[PDB]
TrEMBL record:
Shown residues within the full chain: 4 to 202 of 387
Leader sequence residues: none
All residue ranges annotated as the Pyruvate flavodoxin/ferredoxin oxidoreductase pyrimidine binding domain in the record: 21-169
Name of this protein: 2-oxoglutarate synthase subunit KorA
Taxonomy, superkingdom: Archaea
SUBUNIT field: Heterotetramer of the KorA, KorB, KorC and KorD subunits.
């Protein structure tokens, strides 16, 4: 079923952990532009999404990528987008409404925010971020950096049946 190994350990980087988690969590829509070298997530999603009947939409403008993930979500998809540096602040106003979405930000509010510091946390916090956005019908921010994204660690990648997924009411 899945295009990457599951139900066993693998020695992977933080970005790859994010991608695998997002997909295992049921994400089928991703909108973004390359943000390499700061992140390798676009390319992993470009590879994996077609293999699970999901969608990667490529859009330079940060405003467009978030707006696209919002429309997909309202249309019933588990959706995410990824931005870097200044790009997050451009999304600030789009980010009420009660739309479930995960926004990966690389590098005063009342948003739910998870900030992984290890590869294991990049995995687990990504799953938790989808579960929270569905549970509370709201945007959840996964706040990461290029250091975490490129760290390598051996982590157990669970089988689907081992992972608790919450879906929106």
């Amino acid at each position: 079923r899945f295009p990457f190994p599951v139900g066993e350990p693998d020695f992977i980087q933080g970005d790859e952990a994010i991608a695998r988690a997002a997909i295992l969590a049921g994400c089928r829509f991703y909108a973004g532009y390359p943000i390499t070298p700061a992140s390798e997530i676009f390319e992993a999603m470009a590879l994996y999404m077609p293999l699970v009947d999901g969608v990667v939409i490529q859009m330079e403008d940060e405003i467009a990528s978030i707006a696209a993930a919002i429309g997909a979500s309202w249309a019933g998809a588990k959706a995410m987008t990824a931005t870097s540096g200044p790009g997050f602040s451009l999304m600030q106003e789009n980010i009420m409404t009660e739309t479930p979405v995960v926004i990966v930000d690389v590098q005063d509010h009342s948003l739910i925010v998870l900030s992984p510091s290890t590869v294991q946390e990049a995995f687990d916090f990504t799953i938790r971020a989808f579960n929270l956005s569905e549970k509370y019908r709201t945007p959840v921010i996964l706040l990461t950096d290029a250091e975490v994204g490129h760290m390598r660690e051996r982590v157990y990648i669970p089988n689907p049946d081992e992972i608790e997924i919450i879906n929106r009411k």
